Design a protein around this nucleic acid. Structure first.
Ligand SMILES: [Mg+2]
Ligand SMILES: [Mg+2]
Ligand SMILES: [Mg+2]
Ligand SMILES: [Mg+2]
Ligand SMILES: [Mg+2]
Ligand SMILES: [Mg+2]
Ligand SMILES: [Mg+2]
Ligand SMILES: [Mg+2]
Ligand SMILES: [Mg+2]
Ligand SMILES: [Mg+2]
Ligand SMILES: [Mg+2]
Ligand SMILES: [Mg+2]
Ligand SMILES: [Mg+2]
Ligand SMILES: [Mg+2]
Ligand SMILES: [Mg+2]
Ligand SMILES: [Mg+2]
Ligand SMILES: [Mg+2]
Ligand SMILES: [Mg+2]
Ligand SMILES: [Mg+2]
Ligand SMILES: [Mg+2]
Ligand SMILES: [Mg+2]
Ligand SMILES: [Mg+2]
Ligand SMILES: [Mg+2]
Ligand SMILES: [Mg+2]
Ligand SMILES: [Mg+2]
Ligand SMILES: [Mg+2]
Ligand SMILES: [Mg+2]
Ligand SMILES: [Mg+2]
Ligand SMILES: [Mg+2]
Ligand SMILES: [Mg+2]
Ligand SMILES: [Mg+2]
Ligand SMILES: [Mg+2]
Ligand SMILES: [Mg+2]
Ligand SMILES: [Mg+2]
Ligand SMILES: [Mg+2]
Ligand SMILES: [Mg+2]
Ligand SMILES: [Mg+2]
Ligand SMILES: [Mg+2]
Ligand SMILES: [Mg+2]
Ligand SMILES: [Mg+2]
Ligand SMILES: [Mg+2]
Ligand SMILES: [Mg+2]
Ligand SMILES: [Mg+2]
Ligand SMILES: [Mg+2]
Ligand SMILES: [Mg+2]
Ligand SMILES: [Mg+2]
Ligand SMILES: [Mg+2]
Ligand SMILES: [Mg+2]
Ligand SMILES: [Mg+2]
Ligand SMILES: [Mg+2]
Ligand SMILES: [Mg+2]
Ligand SMILES: [Mg+2]
Ligand SMILES: [Mg+2]
Ligand SMILES: [Mg+2]
Ligand SMILES: [Mg+2]
Ligand SMILES: [Mg+2]
Ligand SMILES: [Mg+2]
Ligand SMILES: [Mg+2]
Ligand SMILES: [Mg+2]
Ligand SMILES: [Mg+2]
Ligand SMILES: [Mg+2]
Lengths: 108, 50, 88, 245
RNA sequence: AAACUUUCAACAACGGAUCUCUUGGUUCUGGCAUCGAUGAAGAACGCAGCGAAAUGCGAUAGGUAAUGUGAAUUGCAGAAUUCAGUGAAUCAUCGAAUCUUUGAACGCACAUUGCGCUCGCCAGUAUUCUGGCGAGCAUGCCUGUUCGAGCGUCAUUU
RNA sequence: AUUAACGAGAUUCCCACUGUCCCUAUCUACUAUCUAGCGAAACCACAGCCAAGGGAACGGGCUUGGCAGAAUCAGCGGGGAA
RNA sequence: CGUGAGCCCGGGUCGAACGGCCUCUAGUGCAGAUCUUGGUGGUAGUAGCAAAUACUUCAAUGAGAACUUGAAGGACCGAAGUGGGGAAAGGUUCCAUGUGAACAGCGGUUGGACAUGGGUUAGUCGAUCCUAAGCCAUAGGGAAGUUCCGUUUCAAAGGGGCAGUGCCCCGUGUGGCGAAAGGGAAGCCGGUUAACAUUCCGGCACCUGGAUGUGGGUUUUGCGCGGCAACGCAACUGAACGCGGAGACGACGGCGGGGGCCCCGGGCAGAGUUCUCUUUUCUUCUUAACGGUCUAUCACCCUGAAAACAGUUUGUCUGGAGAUAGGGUUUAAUGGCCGGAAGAGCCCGACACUUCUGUCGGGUCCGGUGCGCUCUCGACGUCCCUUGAAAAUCCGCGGGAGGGAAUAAUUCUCACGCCAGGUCGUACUCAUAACCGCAGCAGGUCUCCAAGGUGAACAGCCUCUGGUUGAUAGAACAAUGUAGAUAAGGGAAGUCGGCAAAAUAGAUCCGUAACUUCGGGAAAAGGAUUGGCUCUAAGGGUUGGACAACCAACUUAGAACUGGUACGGACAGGGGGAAUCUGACUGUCUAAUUAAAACAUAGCAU
RNA sequence: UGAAGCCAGAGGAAACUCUGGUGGAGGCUCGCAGCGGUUCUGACGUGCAAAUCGAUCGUCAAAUCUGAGCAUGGGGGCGAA
RNA sequence: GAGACCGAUAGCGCACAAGUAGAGUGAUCGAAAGAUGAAAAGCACUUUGAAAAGAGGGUUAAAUAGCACGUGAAAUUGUUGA
């Protein structure tokens, strides 16, 4: 027998917006379902590693999630990774302390 | 094509109503010269030029 | 292969319909009519083609308004009603 | 005849530069109060490749002294620069690689790059891969500095003209043969439409001053006067000499 | 001898010459001066009882109002109450109107019946959102109005 | 000047191979062929047998001879300076 | 009658005007001009209607049937199709009913022909929105002018708040067009028509925008808790301004996961074959969007501190900047399970029936394998003097403005509840008949899906699903043809010339020269084997402690036997060598007589 | 076919050199579709066709092929010429 | 309003549904086509045929005017006669 399928839209070309996956329907027919692109996980602003705890969706889909689902409960939330936030705390403290040490050295 | 561009679809409606034969009663009008539709168009003969 | 073979590759429709003159002469890339020259205010016509002006001149259409001007002048541009017409 | 090939290049429309992949141009930041009396500090965020150039670019981020904003700017990276480096630009900047200093505050014999002829013209001289400008000497009486250009020509510029300490990155690029018509093709495909070149002597008299004849030859001398009439300049224009050096 | 080929006549074919005509052209002469932002010329789409084109007209659509004539229109029924009619007609005249989408075309565009903004009214729990309806929003220039800018500049307070 | 590799480039030779050839023969399909239906075009002064002579010096026509019997079908490529 | 151009008369047809004479006037006399326009011949019932393998029997319809229809038989396309859809282009060719002529280069009862009617339903598909290459306004500057440049400039350019005006805040900067293949909010299944379907009907969802109630959450020192941590939970304030991410990106290679297809078993049903044989040959055994829940590479966190270095991939990378090990967190579903949902669809069997097409019963299952094919995802790797779009839009964070209850307020980023989603396209063909080529033309025209066998293989050949049987036919078998072929002996003597054809050809094993830029030449040259049948051996996985048991499908090697010594048995499938001239090589051009030594190229030089 | 890189073993006093694997580079190579157009100087040559048809052939991972949008306009364009 | 003009291959390209049908991507190019009869009185009815039509019959002054329509030349063709 034959199991070939057809596009369900008038775009006949193998473009990025014309991606399909084959399913089998309850009626016993092989059909195609047009699927959107898969989302990309948000990256860290400093190092660029995939941020844990936040889902990977298309940009418009993030408007549908609740606030806790789009971020972690740390300082820089779902924007910077934990290792980069830890470095920022140490950098801010150490450099500020060195500025004080440099200060008191200047007047004396 | 199936994508019609409404302005174009409006011209195609005009072209098929114009492609009719002449009513019989016109051929009897006491001074008539009209005998047959001399502006008949067929899709296999002449292009609409749209 | 510049003949019968090359005519098969011809499905591109350089010229489209024009809003001003209704001819299929509006260049699609230049957006300029080849007959009436319509990106512009002034209708295109030249004295080196007497036939082209003749096809486009004033007597070739309905004359929706000029046909009545001749009658208005002959009566001297009257106003009002003919001396006691019915109804105000 | 007809219009020859070098005449058609000035009109453009196929001879324009391809710049879709080229982002913001490589130049200094505008001269301001901070750099004129003092220095300002920036951070090299990342070093990038600019198509058709051959020397890497570095995007450096500064702080706006007036607006609470970060001013992005793309310099031309020097051999030694790295991401996370601190860049200091100003009259009082220290003399290290990657710092932008006025030429008047830099000792003779040094090596700088992206020198500017005029104060405010944000970078003019020494911008290709392995090229650099050498400071020959100073003259502080009127504020003028004598430099040496990559071509070997000496020149006098304002002592307030800026420059980046070091040598531009990517040196030695032209030391590797291309070996292939592809490698030349890809080299010029991102620059402009100038490859390949047909030989004028292989053309027809309608097409080029050299074309024609029953043998491929140039009828007259290839040396063309300095003031030829825009279509005669199809050879060695105003050659003081010719032949092997 | 027939057939075939060639010639002529009668009749019959093919073809549309000739003759006669003509709501057409052409040239001359006489008279007149009147397009348009109060939206022209042109274009598109529609409108008839039964119409494709031509002609006419524009959702008031082979047309309305008004005036004159005075019994039609016509290919068929449909007007016979319109017969004193206070009025037929594809009539003539024409001074009142209607005049779709466009077009110099004027909210921005238009290869889209696309996208806007202001005011008023109506409906939906609505000053903000949605729908319907109406009136609007181009550029240059002129006169005036009002609101301003400039240590250009005057005087006073200061 | 010389060059390994490469070449639907030009050239010579050798091996294999074969109908290129000695020297032709045979087979199959579709035509050509006959029939029903349908049905053009190029070309065309008039036409259409030769020999010799003369002639604008290579005639279908002229002159002198040879001759010469309806109507046709399939091939053919001498001539019609086709 | 006249020398003549012409004139006159008789006979036939015809139906409305015409003539002589004297002067005046002219667009006034045709055999030609490769004359112009129209019409008609011989040729001539002639050339021809010959590519794409192919049709036959019966019956019906009808005046008439090779090319109408039904049945039966025989065939072809053979999944890079003669199949199922579309983009451009076309415009009603779509469907039903009927039909004289014309068209379908033969016929025609048939038709993309003719005549009359009917047919295209969207918040979810696309346009519309964004920007790209680019185009056009504005400010200005040229030009006699039609207009040219200019797109952020040498411009007083704009955008919002509070109660037709008033009062405030910011401003660096201030337009539009441009993609039915780029970016992008959201719909799936079943049924239904002569012709529409992600659009109608039934069921079940989703997004955006606007309003707004209940429940729940927070708060009586005002804006949540838990975990060491990676982070989690149903919520859990957040102004200007600023920061970051997504959108957002190359080609190729092997590997791993998943969906679909293919393949192999067993079971329940049905069909085919049955001289004999085959527990046999074939077919159905299905599960959408969507709401959850449990897992799946990388990576990250905690303990701990490694040489006798260890972990580890097909591929050698990682580790005192913290590895192995142990315990966890997390991005990733086209994965399992539940709902949707068996009530659907499908397959059998039993009866109704005048039609309406009605009713009922049963079933709709369980495993395995793989360098299999296709799509997709992921981690690695290679290449670059090549590094492989932008914008609309959305989100997170920093910041802390304003506001906020102790008797009620409050987040309307939690659940449920309410309202609305405008405009245009939507039929059909997508081609050996619906597009372009004067045409129903062997030409040309972008793309998706892609079964079985043989075989390395979308090679050729045969078959299944689906689709055709359309191209003027019948009879003979002359010459000459076009296409396909075979020839004894010789083997290029033919010819300008081995032009054309033949020969070689797959796989395995052996053997391989001069020369050389050391990379090649090289498949050099040149040899041997190949079938069928019966066996044997090797190459694995899982669970229980050099073992035992239960699975698995391919590859390689060895040996007997066997045959008219045949075996890549069809298909498919290099002829080779010795040199000379020339261009280094790959690449390109004279569309429609020249593909070359010409052009180009890297390299060199000026 | 088998370049870098990687693994194992062997030889040597050393310098270092060999062998077997793995790996999968190349404007490499045979070859199907696509693209092109060498020969038959084949068919046709009032053709299917105002350039096609058949066999044979060149290339086939890239200086390969290609759609749509856009730009260049006549003494002008564009040209691996 | 006229003409010592043209008279349907003439006169304007257009005496007619003419700047129309049609061609070209486009700028543009651009035809052919008048006449039954005074009046449709445009052939009722019968018969052969599937039908188109034919034969009778009828209208008209005339069908030797049948919408292929005033007259109807020649090229070219058929029958009869010589
Ligand atoms: Mg798209
Ligand atoms: Mg989370
Ligand atoms: Mg094209
Ligand atoms: Mg040349
Ligand atoms: Mg010259
Ligand atoms: Mg030469
Ligand atoms: Mg005689
Ligand atoms: Mg003779
Ligand atoms: Mg002769
Ligand atoms: Mg004589
Ligand atoms: Mg004689
Ligand atoms: Mg001859
Ligand atoms: Mg012959
Ligand atoms: Mg008369
Ligand atoms: Mg004359
Ligand atoms: Mg004459
Ligand atoms: Mg004559
Ligand atoms: Mg002639
Ligand atoms: Mg014949
Ligand atoms: Mg033939
Ligand atoms: Mg495929
Ligand atoms: Mg298709
Ligand atoms: Mg049909
Ligand atoms: Mg026929
Ligand atoms: Mg017939
Ligand atoms: Mg402009
Ligand atoms: Mg747009
Ligand atoms: Mg789009
Ligand atoms: Mg359909
Ligand atoms: Mg529904
Ligand atoms: Mg809580
Ligand atoms: Mg991004
Ligand atoms: Mg993209
Ligand atoms: Mg399920
Ligand atoms: Mg969905
Ligand atoms: Mg770890
Ligand atoms: Mg999923
Ligand atoms: Mg693919
Ligand atoms: Mg990678
Ligand atoms: Mg539809
Ligand atoms: Mg459809
Ligand atoms: Mg369709
Ligand atoms: Mg198709
Ligand atoms: Mg056509
Ligand atoms: Mg044409
Ligand atoms: Mg196999
Ligand atoms: Mg195959
Ligand atoms: Mg045929
Ligand atoms: Mg010889
Ligand atoms: Mg050629
Ligand atoms: Mg050639
Ligand atoms: Mg050369
Ligand atoms: Mg090929
Ligand atoms: Mg060929
Ligand atoms: Mg030939
Ligand atoms: Mg021939
Ligand atoms: Mg392209
Ligand atoms: Mg008569
Ligand atoms: Mg008559
Ligand atoms: Mg007559
Ligand atoms: Mg005659």
């Amino acid at each position: 027998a034959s199991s070939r399928v057809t596009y369900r839209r008038r775009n006949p070309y193998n473009t990025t917006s014309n991606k399909t996956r084959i399913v089998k329907t309850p009626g016993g027919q092989l059909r195609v379902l047009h699927i959107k692109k898969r989302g990309t996980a948000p990256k860290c602003g400093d190092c660029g590693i995939k941020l844990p705890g936040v889902p990977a969706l298309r940009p418009r889909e993030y408007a549908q999630l609740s606030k806790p689902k789009k971020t972690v409960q740390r300082a820089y939330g779902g924007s910077r990774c934990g290792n980069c936030v830890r470095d920022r705390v140490v950098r801010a403290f150490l450099i500020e302390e060195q500025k004080i040490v440099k200060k008191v050295l200047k007047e004396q | 094509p199936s994508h019609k561009t409404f302005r174009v679809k409006q011209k195609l409606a005009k072209a098929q109503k114009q492609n009719r034969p002449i009513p019989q009663w016109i051929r009897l009008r006491t001074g008539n010269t009209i005998r047959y539709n001399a502006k008949r168009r067929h899709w296999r003969k002449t292009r609409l030029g749209l | 292969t510049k003949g019968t073979s090359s005519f098969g590759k011809r499905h591109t429709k350089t010229h489209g319909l024009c809003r001003r003159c209704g001819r299929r002469s509006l260049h699609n890339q230049k957006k300029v009519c080849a007959s009436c020259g319509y990106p512009a205010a002034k209708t295109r016509k030249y004295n080196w083609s007497e036939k082209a002006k003749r096809r486009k001149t004033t007597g070739t259409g309905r004359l929706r308004y000029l046909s009545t001007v001749s009658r208005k002048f002959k009566n001297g541009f009257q106003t009002g009603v003919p001396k006691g017409s019915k109804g105000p | 005849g007809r219009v020859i090939r070098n005449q058609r290049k000035g009109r453009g429309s196929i001879f324009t530069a391809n710049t879709r992949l080229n982002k913001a141009p490589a130049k200094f930041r505008s001269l301001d109060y901070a750099e004129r009396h003092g220095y300002i500090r920036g951070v090299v965020k990342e070093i990038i490749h600019d198509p058709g150039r051959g020397a890497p670019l570095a995007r450096v981020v500064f702080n706006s002294p007036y607006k609470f904003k970060k001013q992005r700017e793309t310099f031309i990276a020097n051999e030694g620069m790295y991401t996370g480096q601190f860049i200091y630009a100003g009259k009082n900047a220290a003399l290290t690689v990657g710092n932008v200093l006025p030429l008047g505050s830099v000792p003779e014999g040094t090596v700088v790059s992206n020198v500017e002829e005029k104060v405010g013209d944000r970078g003019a001289i020494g911008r290709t891969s392995g090229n650099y400008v050498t400071v020959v000497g100073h003259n502080p009486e009127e504020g003028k500095t004598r430099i040496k250009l990559p071509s070997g020509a000496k020149k006098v510029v304002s002592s307030s003209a800026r420059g980046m300490i070091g040598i531009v990155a990517g040196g030695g690029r032209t030391d590797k043969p291309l070996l292939k018509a592809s490698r030349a093709k890809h080299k010029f495909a991102v620059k402009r439409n100038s490859w390949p070149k047909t030989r004028g002597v292989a053309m027809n008299p309608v097409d080029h001053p050299h074309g024609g004849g029953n043998h491929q030859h140039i009828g007259k001398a290839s040396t063309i006067s300095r003031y030829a009439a825009q279509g005669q300049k199809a050879g060695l224009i105003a050659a003081r000499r010719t032949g092997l050096l």
